[PDB]
Design a protein around this ligand. Structure first.
Ligand SMILES: CCCNC(=O)C1(c2ccc(NC(=O)c3cccc(Cl)c3)cc2)CCC1
Ligand SMILES: CCCNC(=O)C1(c2ccc(NC(=O)c3cccc(Cl)c3)cc2)CCC1
Lengths: 377, 376
């Protein structure tokens, strides 16, 4: 069993178990705006409604789940405020009434004041029926940006992959214990179980096609998830009015912020974040957009003995094959993500008057992964 | 006591205790070049002597101290080779004979193939007399670049600050044990002891003025410690011939690579690595330039519950005061480092940069000053 200091759930992994849906009544003015972003954006009243808020104190957010919900609420409001209708009419100053409590709450949780994956996927969900299991039909998201944005599909399928990967995460202690104890058969079994779980995560990933259409994702949802780091539309970043003097740059929400997007690479010694230029640096930087317990889990994995060096040394075909099943499962996931980038970004981008950087990043990550196979796939 | 897996010595902290001076006879050709850099650089013989080397296997470097000495040797040779006489005539390719074993050894130790703080400060020292204490008068460096470079003063004063901070490092287990056991008075005493040890480290820092000349530092030593990451002189990085096909960028040696430069910020919950600014980015990136045991120690500190959170939760003026004493000691250290950069970089740069380092340190100082609790 993994230690409770890492905030990894047995069932849902890095996802926030049973997220809070309602804030205390003190924050009803926040909740109305966040729950009606589609309507307020279309009516041209979103920015007016945000600007007419009073500066609410964060002190009535007493527990972690209420603080995580408030982050999700404030993050969604912030994206809507900055991006507006999503056609270039932007705002480069986040008003103090929202910016101050958002930044205070963000400092408390050690997350940047921008909507991250941990907000819009890991905390942005509920069970419809609490007695029925974690399947797509028994689940919903808490917040969307626009009507027809496919945020439900995009977020929930991401979450279901995250939950599928939780079955692999719980085997990680067995791997390190087996290595410490020199329990070859136990280690072999653990690696095969991880491979099996990552294969199941890929099958869960296939559900994306049923719940997201390309036009909607590319032209709508991708706009609202965009950040203000190296972005021509907010060249200097965003001014958080009354908290920081200078504008601050933060990257937008993405799958690179998922802890499972790199924890198995780290486990297996696939040196994604080691001296491999841009891709490495990006994966390292995205740790600062994860909850602090989850980033600490990643560096804690790095402090343990190398799984790769254990397998490489042992002259054991069964063990090398079990390691390779895990590495191949990761290759297959990268390949599927590359297919998704083609369908949902490249093709829609070509049909205009695309996401080539993301394609090249995934090709580099896949190449590093494939090259860590002990035998060719 | 701190666990042995973190490679923290009770006396010298993150410094390598009693570093090795001589390699095996197999590496005499490396040792000769490293021991004669002042003469070989000045005469224009360094680069040809490196280029004439046979590619030596790293497999005869049997222990950790031998591998660390070899890193120090190869690191110093590499800086000398890249920068030459330090007048801007640069080498863009490091030849395979040196590059391959340096990159191999670097991969084995999990450090980048460039001279880091852990090489040129933490492993680059000896006592003159083993029976006498760790003082400047009883100490020497193992390698320098040029005659008059003030490498002794710059490296050893950095080391002596590092050693002074070791007295605070050994209190860290007492801090976390006292929090776990709910031992208020033990925690208060531990925080006051850390503040005192950091105050003492500041007084040790004052010796820099006695042993380093601004002109010599700026015009010579700073040049040899420079890396090839965002450096216009090697815009694409350095080619490590026969290891990687494409050139690779790595940052140069600096105090930002010292584990004490951030472990007390981490201990006290001063979120230096949080957010997406330059300072947060830099401090996190510099953990990859620390020895793996030391980066693991920093990770372990962050995995433990927050000292800041504990002190703030208690409504205890005595405990807040002892916490603030540590924060104040850090502010003073940052302020002192700023004064050094003004004297040793900014003023010499004005008399034929430094501004990026100053802004980094001002951000770090401001973040530290904002962490003061005062009332509660
Ligand atoms: C803000 C949500 C971003 N969501 C995505 O961008 C999508 C996605 C989801 C999940 C992943 N995850 C992996 O590829 C992976 C890699 C390694 C190991 C594991 Cl377990 C998983 C990638 C993209 C959903 C459609 C594209
Ligand atoms: C390659 C050596 C680089 N050496 C320096 O650049 C100098 C130096 C030394 C030490 C420090 N250390 C701190 O400022 C500090 C901060 C927080 C906690 C502690 Cl214990 C210490 C900074 C610069 C020496 C003259 C400038």
């Amino acid at each position: 069993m993994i230690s409770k200091e890492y905030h990894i759930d047995e069932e849902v992994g890095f996802a926030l178990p049973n997220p809070q849906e309602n804030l205390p009544d003190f924050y009803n003015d926040w909740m109305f705006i966040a729950k009606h972003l589609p309507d307020l954006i279309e009516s041209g009243q979103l920015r007016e409604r945000v600007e007419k808020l009073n500066m609410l104190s964060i002190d009535h957010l007493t527990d972690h789940k209420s603080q995580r919900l408030a982050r999700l609420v404030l993050g969604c409001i912030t994206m809507a405020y900055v991006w507006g209708k999503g056609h270039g009419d932007v705002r480069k100053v986040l008003p103090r009434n929202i910016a101050v409590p958002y930044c205070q709450l963000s400092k408390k949780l050690e997350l940047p004041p921008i909507l991250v994956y941990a907000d819009c996927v890991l905390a942005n969900w509920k069970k419809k029926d609490p007695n029925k299991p974690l399947t797509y039909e028994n689940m919903d998201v808490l917040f969307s940006f626009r009507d027809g944005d496919c945020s439900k599909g995009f977020f929930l399928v991401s979450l279901l992959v995250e939950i599928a990967a939780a079955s692999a995460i719980k085997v990680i202690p067995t791997v390190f214990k087996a290595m410490q104890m020199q329990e070859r058969d136990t280690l072999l079994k653990a690696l095969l179980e991880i491979a099996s779980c990552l294969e199941k995560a890929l099958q869960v990933f296939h559900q994306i096609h049923d719940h997201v259409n390309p036009k909607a994702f590319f032209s709508v949802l991708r706009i609202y998830l965009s950040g203000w780091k190296g972005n021509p539309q907010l060249s200097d970043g965003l001014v958080y009015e009354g908290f920081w003097e200078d504008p601050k740059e933060f990257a937008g929400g993405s799958a690179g912020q998922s802890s499972v997007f790199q924890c198995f690479d780290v486990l297996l010694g696939i040196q994604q974040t080691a001296g491999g230029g841009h891709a490495a640096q990006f994966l390292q930087d995205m740790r600062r957009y994860m909850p602090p317990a989850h980033r600490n889990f990643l560096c804690s994995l790095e402090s343990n003995p190398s799984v790769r060096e254990f397998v490489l040394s042992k002259g054991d075909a069964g063990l090398r094959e079990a390691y390779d099943a895990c590495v191949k499962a990761l290759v297959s996931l990268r390949s599927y993500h590359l297919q998704i980038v083609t369908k949902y970004i490249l093709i829609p981008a070509s049909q205009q008057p695309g996401g080539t950087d993301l394609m090249n990043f995934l090709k580099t990550v896949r190449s590093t992964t494939e090259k860590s196979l002990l035998k060719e796939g």
